[PDB]
Amino acid sequence: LDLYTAEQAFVRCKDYQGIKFVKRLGKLLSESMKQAEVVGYFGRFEEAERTYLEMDRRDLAIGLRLKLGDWFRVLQLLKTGSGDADDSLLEQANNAIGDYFADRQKWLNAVQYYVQGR
């Protein structure tokens, strides 16, 4: 978490993605938040999610699993705790799992959803 050496490196490899991620990391004004972002940077999504839960942010864990496709994880996380709009995510997740199965031609599984969802 130098964020000053790292940006210089990311320019030394033409890498605009790296620079933009470093800037975004700069916006965050909290440690253990930047730590979560970087353990997400290398793809350790499970580690990032556990970190998010440990610092008592269910909101960001739900959001991260929503950005990726782990809708089953989103359902499990919505099973406990409570959030700002919990039915909205619940319904959205059911419909999304229905779409997940429906594209694979797995009806009778998409139909279980699409019904808990509307």
| Residues at the interface with another protein (CB under 8 A) | 8, 11, 14-17, 19-21, 23, 27-33, 40-41, 43, 45, 55-60, 67-69, 81-88, 90, 103-104, 118
H or E segment to which residue 43 belongs: none
The least CB distance from residue 76 to another protein, in Å, is 16
State the minimum distance, in angstroms, from the CB of residue 111 to another protein. 17
Write out 51-105 in H/E/C secondary structure: HHHHCCCHHHHHHHHHHCCCHHHHHHHHHCCCCCCHHHHHHHHHHHHHHHHHCCC
**Shortest distance, position 21 Cβ to another protein, whole Å:** 7
